[PDB]
Amino acid sequence: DVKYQIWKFGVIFTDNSFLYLGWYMVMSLLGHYNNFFFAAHLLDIAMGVKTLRTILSSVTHNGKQLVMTVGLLAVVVYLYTVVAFNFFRKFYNKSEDEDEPDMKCDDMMTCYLFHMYVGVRAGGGIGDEIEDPAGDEYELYRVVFDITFFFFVIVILLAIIQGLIIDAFGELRDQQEQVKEDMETKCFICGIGSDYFDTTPHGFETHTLEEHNLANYMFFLMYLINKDETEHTGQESYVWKMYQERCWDFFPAGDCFRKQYEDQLS
Amino acid sequence: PYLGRIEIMGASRRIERIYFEISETNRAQWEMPQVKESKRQFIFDVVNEGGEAEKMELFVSFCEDTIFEMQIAAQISEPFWGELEVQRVKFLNYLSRNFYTLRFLALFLAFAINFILLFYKVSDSPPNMVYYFLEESTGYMEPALWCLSLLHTLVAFLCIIGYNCLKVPLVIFKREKELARKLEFDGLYITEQPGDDDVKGQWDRLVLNTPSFPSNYWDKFVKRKVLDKHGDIFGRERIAELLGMDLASLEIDVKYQIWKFGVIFTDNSFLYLGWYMVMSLLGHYNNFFFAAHLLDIAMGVKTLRTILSSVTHNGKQLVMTVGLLAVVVYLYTVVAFNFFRKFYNKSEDEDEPDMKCDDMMTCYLFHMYVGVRAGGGIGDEIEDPAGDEYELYRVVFDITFFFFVIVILLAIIQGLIIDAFGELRDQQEQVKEDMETKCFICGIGSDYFDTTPHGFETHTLEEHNLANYMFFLMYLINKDETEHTGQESYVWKMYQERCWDFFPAGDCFRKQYEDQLS
Numbered sequence A: 001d002v003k004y005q006i007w008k009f010g011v012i013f014t015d016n017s018f019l020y021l022g023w024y025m026v027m028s029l030l031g032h033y034n035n036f037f038f039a040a041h042l043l044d045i046a047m048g049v050k051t052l053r054t055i056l057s058s059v060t061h062n063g064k065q066l067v068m069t070v071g072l073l074a075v076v077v078y079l080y081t082v083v084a085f086n087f088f089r090k091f092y093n094k095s096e097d098e099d100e101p102d103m104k105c106d107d108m109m110t111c112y113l114f115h116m117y118v119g120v121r122a123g124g125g126i127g128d129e130i131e132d133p134a135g136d137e138y139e140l141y142r143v144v145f146d147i148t149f150f151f152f153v154i155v156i157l158l159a160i161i162q163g164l165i166i167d168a169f170g171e172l173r174d175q176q177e178q179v180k181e182d183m184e185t186k187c188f189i190c191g192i193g194s195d196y197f198d199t200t201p202h203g204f205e206t207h208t209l210e211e212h213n214l215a216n217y218m219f220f221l222m223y224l225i226n227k228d229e230t231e232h233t234g235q236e237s238y239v240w241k242m243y244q245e246r247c248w249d250f251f252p253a254g255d256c257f258r259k260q261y262e263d264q265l266s
Numbered sequence B: 001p002y003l004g005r006i007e008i009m010g011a012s013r014r015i016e017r018i019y020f021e022i023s024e025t026n027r028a029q030w031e032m033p034q035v036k037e038s039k040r041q042f043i044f045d046v047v048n049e050g051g052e053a054e055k056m057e058l059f060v061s062f063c064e065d066t067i068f069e070m071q072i073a074a075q076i077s078e079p080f081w082g083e084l085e086v087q088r089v090k091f092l093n094y095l096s097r098n099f100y101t102l103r104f105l106a107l108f109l110a111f112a113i114n115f116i117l118l119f120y121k122v123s124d125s126p127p128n129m130v131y132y133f134l135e136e137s138t139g140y141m142e143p144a145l146w147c148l149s150l151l152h153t154l155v156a157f158l159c160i161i162g163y164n165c166l167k168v169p170l171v172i173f174k175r176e177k178e179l180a181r182k183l184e185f186d187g188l189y190i191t192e193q194p195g196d197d198d199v200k201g202q203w204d205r206l207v208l209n210t211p212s213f214p215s216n217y218w219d220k221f222v223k224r225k226v227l228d229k230h231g232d233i234f235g236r237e238r239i240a241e242l243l244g245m246d247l248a249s250l251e252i253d254v255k256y257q258i259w260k261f262g263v264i265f266t267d268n269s270f271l272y273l274g275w276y277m278v279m280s281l282l283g284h285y286n287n288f289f290f291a292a293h294l295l296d297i298a299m300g301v302k303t304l305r306t307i308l309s310s311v312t313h314n315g316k317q318l319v320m321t322v323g324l325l326a327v328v329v330y331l332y333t334v335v336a337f338n339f340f341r342k343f344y345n346k347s348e349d350e351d352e353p354d355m356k357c358d359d360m361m362t363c364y365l366f367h368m369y370v371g372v373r374a375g376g377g378i379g380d381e382i383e384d385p386a387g388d389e390y391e392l393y394r395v396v397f398d399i400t401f402f403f404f405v406i407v408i409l410l411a412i413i414q415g416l417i418i419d420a421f422g423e424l425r426d427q428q429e430q431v432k433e434d435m436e437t438k439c440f441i442c443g444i445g446s447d448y449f450d451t452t453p454h455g456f457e458t459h460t461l462e463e464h465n466l467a468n469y470m471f472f473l474m475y476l477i478n479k480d481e482t483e484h485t486g487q488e489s490y491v492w493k494m495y496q497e498r499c500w501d502f503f504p505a506g507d508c509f510r511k512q513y514e515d516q517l518s
């Protein structure tokens, strides 16, 4: 069946894990061409180690926010670059030798490159790099320039990144806590809270382990699938029909054996 | 689908079901994404900073604003003086329809222009005055920039016009509605009088006498109603002259335009668009003014605006923390100016000393400029104190500066931003939790309705749909009063009296007829 084989191969080749393993095989081939391609397999620790993957989830949880924050930093550095290129061209000379000047803000492209490369990697901003403004008619304007750069880009715009990562840690933690709290508070199948079943000691534990075990529901589906239809009992056939019709009305929703026969049992 | 149902508390003092027809146009307008976003914003605002006392008043006002917006959208939707008028109205409708696409186009043009401006240079010689010329090998970039600047100014003007034709009517409608309510139910200009410090009320004083005071507001009888309410106490001729009404004609507009223009020019979004147009004009004078349009990304991109909300949430705390840093650096400056003047010499050459703490002004400037931008504080900059009688005092000086200013006073800023992230997150979570736990209209929790499977979902989708309440208000407003049924007239009267006692509060059809249904 060549048509079915082609379809299956397309589906397989559109699969992310298979593509990752193929990339692993490709870099392993290229290692023989140049052994240092084997360093691209160290990145497999992120996919392998669950601790590393969980740590990197803090980075990737707010990934779009991080990208937008980097773009915002790029925009604001462009604004500072424009202001420098129009008013502070003299201070950007990075040559001690007077034989040749090396002014780095006589072009918008090179001044933006200089800003994005040194002003954001400097601890004090661009004023760490450029000429001292003391004894100049633009001294107050240039100290405002430098200190606003330091406040907005160095402090605020990296505090945003750190806060995004910290908030990712906290958000993932509270997501896990909320999942655990919901699971241990209400029954998965029927939704009745543990407060109802706790009237009987260990009532919720008994109900979830025995009465409404999702493992038991999975095993019953296995039983139905692997049992011949001719030998299904009445209730087995009823569930089999409801399953073939994709109607999940045989799952007890908000009701249980205890709640139904409370009058008789008590 | 077209059959909407709501529950009200009727004249029989029990919950009742009202059935009415919903138009497909109105349903589509409700499903529109902008209307959905406005609804979500209203829900968040009310749940975060609202209470039960005024929640229904706020909800009714929101419904009225939504109805007016739907009317505007329906009007602008597209199916010798006459020809030019048809051309003008068609053009204005096109602008109103494509306002948001024009705003996106203006943002794209700003990005294109600012990318072109990255090929700029400065030259002393023409291509001691300096010459600014855009250098590019191909040379098509100069005509591209010229045409892009012209097109950008045109698009900004078109954005202003589209705003004036699309969003201004809602501002005027809200203004007139609020004035009518506070004039008829509070006697704002009949008994209370404005406080003379409310510029809003003082300027609204100009529109009472106008022959066309309500023009977007659909309450045509506002003047007659306020006259009937306040005449028997405050006279009738006085009320008639206040409202510009002729009593004789009751039985058997440059002033309004000025008031509307003042209200429009006091509007923040219109002022921002005017500033955009002004900087677009100044771009032709000096192309680099087009870099002030990059700031429009904050107003445009929702992701960027949400990120910047972390900065602006604790803005006053940030400003106060900067002022505190300034005060403490002043204290350190005073201590330096009195005890450590020698160490602040910033000249290697012995020919001339450059001591930077022989004046309080220059020492404060030096501290605020270098000690807070240095990683180790002021001791990174000033002379080493080793082998001096003030060595211990000066190491205490430097290390206290490093601890308090460098560490503590920037950790405060970072903690303010992080706490802003967390606080906004928990605000969103609390709003979602409240909305999914209790019914918006009646307040009965989901625990009650969950006894029936999918009971809360059924109740919120069908029994107490706030969308259904909004649609019923549309139905009442657009239906003639003579053909109102009994319950429709009851709700219409309670609505005209601004009494929200027909909203079922703590009661529902299920809770009322539980005995009979079970």
Ligand SMILES: Nc1ncnc2c1ncn2[C@@H]1O[C@H](COP(=O)(O)OP(=O)(O)O)[C@@H](O)[C@H]1O
Pocket (backbone or CB within 6 Å): A183, A184, A186, A187, A188, A189, A204, A205, A208, A209, A212, A213, A214, A215
């Ligand atoms: N229908 C359900 N079936 C099984 N466990 C349930 C169900 N509803 C709630 N739970 C709860 O799920 C939790 C999972 O614990 P357990 O069943 O021991 O599995 P595991 O430790 O592998 O997660 C228990 O506290 C249990 O009470």
Ligand SMILES: Nc1ncnc2c1ncn2[C@@H]1O[C@H](COP(=O)(O)OP(=O)(O)O)[C@@H](O)[C@H]1O
Pocket (backbone or CB within 6 Å): B036, B435, B436, B438, B439, B440, B441, B456, B457, B460, B461, B464, B465, B466, B467
């Ligand atoms: N009176 C109400 N009308 C509508 N939704 C309500 C009401 N009270 C609570 N809700 C809840 O509001 C939530 C909003 O979801 P939904 O109605 O699908 O709208 P959307 O997804 O656009 O926010 C639902 O979980 C719903 O149960």
Ligand SMILES: [Zn+2]
Pocket (backbone or CB within 6 Å): A187, A188, A189, A190, A191, A192, A207, A212, A256
């Ligand atoms: Zn259960």
Ligand SMILES: [Zn+2]
Pocket (backbone or CB within 6 Å): B439, B440, B441, B442, B443, B444, B459, B464, B508
């Ligand atoms: Zn309700």
